[PDB]
RNA sequence: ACCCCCGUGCCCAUAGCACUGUGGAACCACCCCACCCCAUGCCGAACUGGGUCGUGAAACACAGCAGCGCCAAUGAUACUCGGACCGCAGGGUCCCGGAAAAGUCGGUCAGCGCGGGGGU
RNA sequence: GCGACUGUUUACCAAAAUCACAGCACUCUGCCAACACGAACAGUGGACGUAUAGGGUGUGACGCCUGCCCGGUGCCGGAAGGUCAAGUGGAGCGGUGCAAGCUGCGAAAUGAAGCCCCGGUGAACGGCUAAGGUAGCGAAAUUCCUUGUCGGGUAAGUUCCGACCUGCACGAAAGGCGUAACGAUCUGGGCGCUGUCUCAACGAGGGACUCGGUGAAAUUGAAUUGGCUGUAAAGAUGCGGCCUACCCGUAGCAGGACGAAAAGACCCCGUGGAGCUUUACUAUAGUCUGGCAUUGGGAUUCGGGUUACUUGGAUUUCUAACCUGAAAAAUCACUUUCGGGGACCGUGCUUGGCGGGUAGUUUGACUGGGGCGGUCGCCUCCCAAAAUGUAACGGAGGCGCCCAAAGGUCACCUCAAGACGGUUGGAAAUCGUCUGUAGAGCGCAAAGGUAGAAGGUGGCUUGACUGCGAGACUGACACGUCGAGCAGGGAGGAAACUCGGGCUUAGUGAACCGGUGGUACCGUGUGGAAGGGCCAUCGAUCAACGGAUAAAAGUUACCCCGGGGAUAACAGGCUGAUCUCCCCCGAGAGUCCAUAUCGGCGGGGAGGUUUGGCACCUC
RNA sequence: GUAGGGGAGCGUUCAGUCCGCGGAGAAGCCAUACCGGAAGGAGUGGUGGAGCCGACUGAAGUGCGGAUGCCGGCAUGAGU
RNA sequence: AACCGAACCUGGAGAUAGCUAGUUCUCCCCGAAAUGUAUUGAGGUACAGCCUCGGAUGUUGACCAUGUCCUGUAGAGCACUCACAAGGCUAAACCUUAUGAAACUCCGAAGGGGCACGCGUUUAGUCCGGGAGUGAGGCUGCGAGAGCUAACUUCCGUAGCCGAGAGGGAAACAACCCAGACCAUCAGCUAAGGUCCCUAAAUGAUCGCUCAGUGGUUAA
RNA sequence: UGUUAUGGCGUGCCUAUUGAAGCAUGAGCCGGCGACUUAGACCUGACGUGCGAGCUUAAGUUGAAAAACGGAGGCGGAGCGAAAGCGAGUCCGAAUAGGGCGGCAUUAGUACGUCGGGCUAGACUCGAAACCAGGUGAGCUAAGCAUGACCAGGUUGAAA
RNA sequence: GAAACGAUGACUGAAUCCGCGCGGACCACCGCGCAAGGCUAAAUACUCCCAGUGACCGAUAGCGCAUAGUACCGUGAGGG
RNA sequence: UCAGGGAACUGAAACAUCUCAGUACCUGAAGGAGAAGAAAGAGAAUUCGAUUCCGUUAGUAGCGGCGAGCGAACCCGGAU
């Protein structure tokens, strides 16, 4: 607590509450064949975390109609999803 | 930075309104009174600006 | 030591220190203009080993 | 007494014919003795420094005024 | 093209001072007036406003002058890189290169541009 | 000389001048005493005692006696006032809800022992500023200078005796002075006597020596183990050179093998230990105290509210609680006559104070050993040997600020000094005219730097601004430094432009913890709030200044442990200031004559016996 | 070439596996002039009177001159 | 209860021990450090420097030349500051003559340092990552301080060696001079040093010196 | 091979150190004993292997001259921020200045094993003065209480 | 510490059906739960004793003991 | 195993909290096992549903001279 450690300048806050799950739009998309996205099916598209929500993301700049059933998504996402042909689902 | 009962005092900075601390160290010596001045906060800028709290 | 959760030196990409300025802040301040507002980043490329060492794990 | 110590610094820290940058300190004194040439910027402890890029040249019109300047390459 | 004057640079004493001579309406200065714009913590000395005479005396420009400044060789030496030695020591020498300061000779009172003006 | 005496003590280096006694003094104690042992209102000791009785303390037969100063400390007493804990009480403030209401924070006043304040007490601490040595004694066991000065004794006396005095630093109960007797005590002198000496001899016995029998020990790197000189970690049997020396014993001496024994007593070091001390920190036994239980009755006064129901504090008084004593079946349990005390005390919880009796700890480092002295951060020169950097208990001097302007900007002015000449001056200055690369100035220290200003003034103002900072100097890090440009908006100037503190380099310091204003992130069912976060800012002789803990002084010769020739005292080594000795020149003294003798000022060497320096082997 | 880092191996006990040896005689001990770059390995002889090499692989109570080391035995001091 | 400024036994307990000692088989390769800064730190630690192993990069390394720039030491000098010798003038100032200077500088090398490049030779450096050790130096020469221009003294700067370096020389001898040991050999040339004898090697050549045993301890 | 004469040469070992044959430490001799380990799905790295954008189970159950079952969970997979949150982007900020991060021309992990090292345990071995708890001792010694014993002989000659 | 709740020593002292406690002071809403009475296999720990097994020792090892808490030391606890 | 009572060295490179640690020791009671136990709970899903133990959560949330360092629980799986 004197060699390096402390004598920093430090507190913050900690607090931690929802951490999502990144979807990467290239695994939707790009491969697959859409085999239903929901919320039993998708546990098998290398998605398997449980506990937490699911968040969707865009990554992938690829043309195709698909539909999405995640629990949260982003603003570019949607206007991406939307855009190719589909429909993006949160729960009410 | 030794503070104790002599001359000059650090004084505070106030504002009409807006809020923010210009920190300036003054003294009592001389002309002690009229410490008004003219700060921009973060506000339209440009307001009645005074260090005398 | 749980200190370091809450210690400028959160683990990075990289997996560097994340430092601020231990210069001057609260308590003794009054002179310079904007040594104050100073509150930016720190990195150092000789006391990272022994140091994420404490957290590095708990990232 | 053999107190009392200073290190201190000081001295020219971009000599002749060096290539400098926008940002790069020249020299570091204490009163007016290298004085800023053309390209040449002096800070409050007069300080030189650059303005951009180029060759950092030396002027001495015989001792008293000395000068330090910056001819671009390109 | 000749010269000259005025302004403004490079150069920022080998281009500086002193002494002395030349210049008289093209230019420059002093001078005259100056209740007001403007102004000297007092005074229109200087800033400034409006313009004759006179003068060039002073200042300025040029020219002579190098008494004093300034600049400043050759030769030699001090010191010294490197190489190799001496004395108990303070110290000192040899070889090989680099190489002062000071002083001496001497050197010169500039030189080089741009613009405007008025004369032959 | 000391102590009065008999006596007592360190089992195993101290028998004394130690302690202890009779005698004396101060003080506490009202009897379940004071006091003491104890987890325990049990029990016991004091004491089957009880006021010339018992506990504590000091002095120490006896005789003459015991002074001056109580400011502080302690204690006793007084106590108007000043402050003070829990508690009694409650305004205001604040949160949540539709509300009733349920709830945080929190006073004025009042409130115990103490402390402050007043006085007194010294055979209490204690002094000789609260006052200063009354008697007696005096170089005494206090003595430094000192072997003091004189006298006595001796042929000759540093100690001894007697006086005197300049008592470094005697003194009347940590008693002063003196005193018969006493003393395995300490000091000096004398008589007698002597092997204690001059100065040793002779004799004896028990060992030592020899033979037979039995037969250990500490120690031990290995040994085939000389002398002188030198070298080597600096005092050589294994190194060098020279010298000497056949092999092997026995009896004997102790110079050497830095001989043995015991990781060293001293000394230093270690954020080692232990015993002890106090006005070091802190806590506690113990004790004091208010309130609240056990814990009730009858009156008066004082407080108030409610429509006499009362609730409290104090005084007083009586008793069924409780406590204690006697008699009959001593300790009790018991019924009783009763005796007294009796709402206090004791005990339990809680508050505050006192508290070295006890307990756990702290008490720095550098340092030509340690201590003492001095010094730690920062700024400038020099050392620093021409980049930078660079040590010392090397050589000098500063800072822990200041300025509402000494800032920003825009205008404007040009210094010190001398000469000449002038009036309250007759050195400087006030004025004027010359000379004058500044020989001045810049708030302070210094260097660098500045005349085209960073010198001096005036107008206008608050850039001593917010959100940032490419790219660099510097540091191990953490810090620290410098900075164009960009944004929101301002200042001066006609304008270009400049300004995000002062010519710069010191005028300061992490993190934790907390105060204040602001913004609204979190707020553990939800919606708020307490609280926490963020922006800003406040608290720091943390001066041992990169800061240990919120909070800390000494002592050990009663000492222990872990280490060190990393480090001192002895010795040796190196050096040679100092010490000792020699030499050179020669002024002069020596009646005349430098040198028969003596040698001012001054200089050159030797030795290694002095005091030292250094720290090399040996802790 | 010291502190230190890196590499390749020897040796010992136990374990699995394989090839085996042993009364005409194992291990152990004793001698030796041979082999390998080291740690080491082998032949022969002597002693012995029951068990044990080599290869590969795995695991360790794995290699001693020191610690005023621990245990034990025997020396020196001496026939003192 | 044969050793008491806190008994003995057992236990906590393998208490802590920035301390002392000790730490065992082999060969091969590289190869340090005793510096800086901070520390209740000074014989201990952290970090940097210095070492090794791996990977990447792959000449940026090194020496040296040229070009360029920067620094005020040695010397020197008297123009500022302090000090200072003689004389003139009438104490200072000024003049002639003459000085001394870490904290004076009108002047000012050698050398050093930064950058660029290679006209050329050579060989490493940086970055990322695992493991370290070392943070008590010593001597001599030069350049300083301190000290008596003393010390095998002490404290800094720089070069070399010892430390971890054998071998030859200097009698002996860490350091000095010459030289960096892979292994074997009854082979040869040299360095520093020497060549009568004790050890190898010309009682060698020519021209001088010294009557001393100087060489083979010093000065006025 | 053994032994030996003679010649040359030749300062034990370890430790600790600037520096050791040291007159510095240790050690009589030999034998045997005797010191860097083990644990924690822990942390980090090298190497190796099986899988691979996925890679693995733990407790346990059932079977044991054999092992399979068991996917609660952990590591990859998105970052940035004090947090809400937002997201290939987010914090500071009244929108463009920068720090962190993706894309970089380009770099996958995971489980197990052996090994380097870290951590927490006694952590390489041996060693102290001391501190704490419980208990044993007054049969030595310092004292008290109770009950008993002992002091030849001689001298001096108080009160009454 | 914003410090709930459980527990306890000393003082005090509530309700029970439009009730009581709790849900990290507190309040409303909401949600969970009903003390002041008791008992109660198994899954768990350990091992004197017994069997089996061992990359456990083979006697300076292994328990201290190939039997002995004996001899031996201490007043004793105790050591051995 | 439960209960009454309850250290210090050591660590914080000093030491007061805190750690060591409710460790050691002491004592009481009882068994072949004890403790605990049938909700005024956990918890945030309008859920699970005696207790204990194991895995995991996780070394997270949180405690702390915010230093040294200490350290849960719910969900889920499993023994029963
Ligand atoms: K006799
Ligand atoms: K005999
Ligand atoms: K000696
Ligand atoms: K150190
Ligand atoms: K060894
Ligand atoms: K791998
Ligand atoms: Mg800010
Ligand atoms: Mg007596
Ligand atoms: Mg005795
Ligand atoms: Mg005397
Ligand atoms: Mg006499
Ligand atoms: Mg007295
Ligand atoms: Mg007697
Ligand atoms: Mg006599
Ligand atoms: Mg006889
Ligand atoms: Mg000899
Ligand atoms: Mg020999
Ligand atoms: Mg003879
Ligand atoms: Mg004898
Ligand atoms: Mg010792
Ligand atoms: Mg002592
Ligand atoms: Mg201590
Ligand atoms: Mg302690
Ligand atoms: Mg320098
Ligand atoms: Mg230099
Ligand atoms: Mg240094
Ligand atoms: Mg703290
Ligand atoms: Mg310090
Ligand atoms: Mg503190
Ligand atoms: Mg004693
Ligand atoms: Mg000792
Ligand atoms: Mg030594
Ligand atoms: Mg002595
Ligand atoms: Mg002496
Ligand atoms: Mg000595
Ligand atoms: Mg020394
Ligand atoms: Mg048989
Ligand atoms: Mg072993
Ligand atoms: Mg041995
Ligand atoms: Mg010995
Ligand atoms: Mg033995
Ligand atoms: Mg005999
Ligand atoms: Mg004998
Ligand atoms: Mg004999
Ligand atoms: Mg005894
Ligand atoms: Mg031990
Ligand atoms: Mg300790
Ligand atoms: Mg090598
Ligand atoms: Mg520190
Ligand atoms: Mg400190
Ligand atoms: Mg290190
Ligand atoms: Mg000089
Ligand atoms: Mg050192
Ligand atoms: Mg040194
Ligand atoms: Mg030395
Ligand atoms: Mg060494
Ligand atoms: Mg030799
Ligand atoms: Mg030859
Ligand atoms: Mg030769
Ligand atoms: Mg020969
Ligand atoms: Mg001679
Ligand atoms: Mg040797
Ligand atoms: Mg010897
Ligand atoms: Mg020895
Ligand atoms: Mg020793
Ligand atoms: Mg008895
Ligand atoms: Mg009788
Ligand atoms: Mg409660
Ligand atoms: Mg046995
Ligand atoms: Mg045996
Ligand atoms: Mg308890
Ligand atoms: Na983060
Ligand atoms: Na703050
Ligand atoms: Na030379
Ligand atoms: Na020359
Ligand atoms: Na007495
Ligand atoms: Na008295
Ligand atoms: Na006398
Ligand atoms: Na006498
Ligand atoms: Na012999
Ligand atoms: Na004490
Ligand atoms: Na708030
Ligand atoms: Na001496
Ligand atoms: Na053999
Ligand atoms: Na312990
Ligand atoms: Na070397
Ligand atoms: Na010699
Ligand atoms: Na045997
Ligand atoms: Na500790
Ligand atoms: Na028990």
């Known amino acids: ?92 | ?53 | 030591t749980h200190k370091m959760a809450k210690r400028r030196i959160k683990i990075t990409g990289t997996g560097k220190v994340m430092a601020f300025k231990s210069g001057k802040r609260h308590q003794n301040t009054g002179k310079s203009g904007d040594e104050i507002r100073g509150k930016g980043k720190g990195f150092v490329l000789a006391k990272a080993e022994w140091a994420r060492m404490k957290l590095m794990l708990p990232r | 007494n053999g107190r009392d110590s200073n290190p201190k610094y000081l001295g020219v820290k971009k000599f002749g014919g060096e290539v400098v940058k926008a940002g790069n300190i020249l020299v570091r004194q204490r009163g007016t003795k290298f004085k800023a040439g053309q390209g040449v910027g002096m800070g409050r402890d007069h300080t030189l420094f650059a303005l951009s890029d180029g060759k950092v040249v030396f002027i001495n019109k015989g001792k008293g005024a000395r000068f330090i300047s910056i001819e671009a390459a390109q």
């Open chain 2, 1 to 53: 930075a030794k503070d104790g009962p002599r001359i000059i005092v650090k004084m505070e900075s106030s504002a009409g309104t807006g809020f923010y601390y210009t920190t300036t160290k003054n003294r009592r010596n001389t002309q002690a009174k009229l410490e008004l001045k003219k700060y921009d906060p973060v506000a339209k800028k440009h307001v009645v600006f005074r260090e005398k709290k």
């Open chain 1, 1 to 92: 607590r004197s060699r390096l450690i402390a004598r920093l300048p430090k507190r913050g806050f900690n607090n931690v509450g929802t951490t999502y799950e990144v979807v990467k739009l290239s695994q939707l998309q790009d491969l697959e064949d859409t085999t239903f996205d929901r919320d039993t099916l998708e546990a098998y598209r290398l998605v398997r975390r449980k506990n937490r929500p699911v968040k969707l993301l865009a990554s992938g700049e690829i043309s195709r109609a698909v539909t999405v059933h995640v629990d949260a998504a982003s603003a570019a996402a949607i206007k991406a999803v939307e855009a190719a042909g589909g429909r993006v689902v949160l729960p009410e």
